[PDB]
Amino acid sequence: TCPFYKKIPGTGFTVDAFQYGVVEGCTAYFLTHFHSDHYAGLSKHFTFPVYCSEITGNLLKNKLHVQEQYIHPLPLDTECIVNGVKVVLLDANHCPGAVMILFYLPNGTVILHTGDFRADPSMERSLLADQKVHMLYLDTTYCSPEYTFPSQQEVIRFAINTAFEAVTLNPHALVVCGTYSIGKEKVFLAIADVLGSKVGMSQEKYKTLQCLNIPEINSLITTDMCSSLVHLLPMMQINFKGLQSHLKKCGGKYNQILAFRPTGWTHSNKFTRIADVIPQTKGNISIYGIPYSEHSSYLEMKRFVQWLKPQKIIPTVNVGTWKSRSTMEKYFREWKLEAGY
Template sequence: MEEEPKRSKPSPAISSSCPPMALEITTDGRLPLSDELDENGFPVGPLSSSSFDDGGGDRGGDPQIEASIASTSDFASDFYRCGTDWSCLAEESSAGKENRELVQRDLFQMWGIKKPADGWGSGSGSLVSSPSRKTRRRMIGGAGGGDRVDQEVPQLKRMRFDRGSDRLPVCPFYKKIPGTPFTVDAFRHGPIEGCSAYFLSHFHHDHYGGLGKKWSHGPIYCTPLTARLVKMCLSVNALYIRPLELDAEHVIEGTKVTLLEANHCPGAALIHFRLSNGQIHLHTGDFRACKQMESYPLLLSHHINVLYLDTTYCNPKYRFPPKEDVVDFIVRTARKCLEKQPKTLIAVGAYSIGKEHVYAAISQALEVPIYTDSSRRRILQSFDWPELSRKLCSCGRTSPLHVLPISFLRHENLSEYLKTYKQQYAAVLAFRPTGWTYSGTTGNQLDLIKPSSKGNITIYGVPYSEHSSFPELRDFVKFLKPDKIIPTVNAGNPTSREKMQAYFREWLKS
């Protein structure tokens, strides 16, 4: 992963980005699936056409929204029509009922898969079923992206799975922009029917996964910096890469598209789509909402109909401080440590891109260069960030500031790493900057953070995140007041979805 350990993606359709799922297969090799599934993996058939009161006002029956998604499945149509309360729409199958209504179901029911008698886990999304002698477990969809089926199961053909990796699951509808031939961060699915433009929000693996030198399915639209990384790191043919400058309107397939700064990693963008029918969709990709976004002219002057929202930290417990405050704390801590032990090696954890402001601030404050390996230096030098490029060095012995993979920052690893530099340094001070390092601290309480120390190795987990905190998400939604919110993160089970929908309804009331 190139990002913070992220959470399962929304799972309305089984895709290669979904966590592995254990399915019970009976002795005759059949899955108890419903008779028909649409291209998104949902039961087909007419669903209720009534509007839904989501607690935030009646948003049902908008003819513009319905027209823009006329080509999608019945489920997708109801999804876009039902306001913010979209959780687990499924058909009520009560005998004798002519007028069918939509009810909330868990994901297995929504896919038409019968729930085993011994249970499939709890609301947390864990899978704990134990197969009997008459059943066998099969894993469908691994973290590595390749879909694996150990034996031929005819029913899987309805869900567009095949043996091996020759055929991929279809793109889930929530990655498609209805009313357009566009998809966002949907590269794992091969050529997508009806898609003539593929958008990439930023250069993190869980978003660009599927791109490579063999890509030939259509043009890739992204920021210039992301375009350079796609070409340099993934060897994608330059003929398919279409960089779009930030804050400039581009007309693509009849839709006006504008990329806005996302305050995430370098090159990340919010994607603003203005459809020919007047509908406006805003896809945040991954972002950290801030007050500056409330001054974006495009967001001030145009009402957002559909918001695709990065909900990584859509939980009230995540109230970490502003990035600037966390960086100041890191710099203060580094200085204090060096005063006590001048022969201290400072290590900062980072992904292939992201967290640059942390080690750039330390470098500036301590007036020392930044050591990274050659691969990271090559990436950083492509940013067109002269102040940072000038500070990079290629020898670890000439600088006490080292940038390392964030997953490497463990006591045992750092102890071994220190042995390489035992002539220069006697201790290691490491910082793991991630919002997942939650300490309950805000504001000036950062000084209450307790490090983890073993011998001469000290590791600080600091709440520095490039995703929005809960209050920042709330303020952003209240500023935009969109008609509909589609969470793109942590929507993998009914419990989390229902909680997020409750937050959305509350935010949209005011």
């Protein structure tokens, strides 16, 4: 059965609620982004209206074969009317096509659902600045003070400098980057750009990336592995056995692998700066775990909420345990008392 935190009161709407069958009294199903814990349940047999971004709609049509007549893409930053309710989609700074949703209820309540997001001060100058929000459905993935991480910019600088140095030292080194969903494309694209290479990948991943509207993508990605020195592989193959085997497949073109695993957080962050990160090495294979997050850190999330001053917060992540819930509720109270709302 659908949980309460996926239902928008006073509407016929749900959010990211496709794995529960036909939800009672749902007239429109919203999808914030194309990640499997959120889209799980969609297919060519789905015949209810789905509301989403243009990019998410490309992925629905091409990857899951949802029929076009049921896909309702909305432009960002634009007031739209859905089943008589005004809505706006805003950029969530998560993966490509990821949105937050503002709902303007007929009785005057204003609700923001963040979907998955990485809070940023740039958001303080969208259509959010223009009115009060009464309820916030918040991505609380990293809602605990131990979750610090560097900016995306610092992490990309580290990866580019590391890859550029390694391949300059050894022109026969291969760089490999792990992936298992859309998101974090900047990792492999920035590395390929500094090395003057395209990124080689499977036909299926290349198809997924072509759905995204990324400018000059035919310019950075390819299915011809032979001509590329940056390869993308499934995250599951990013280990010593998987990479030894891949290296065998390249036919003596290469004699070393430098691999990257962009993780969310890892407890090395509590003791280590980005400058100080080192790889795991075995033989002629090195693996770097890099803290590239597409969710808010604790401090980024705190700042966003203290700026927005919602009257009620409803968490959407880590809700399954009483200890997690109570912990998060305590932080929300602190934030409110410290900010004065």
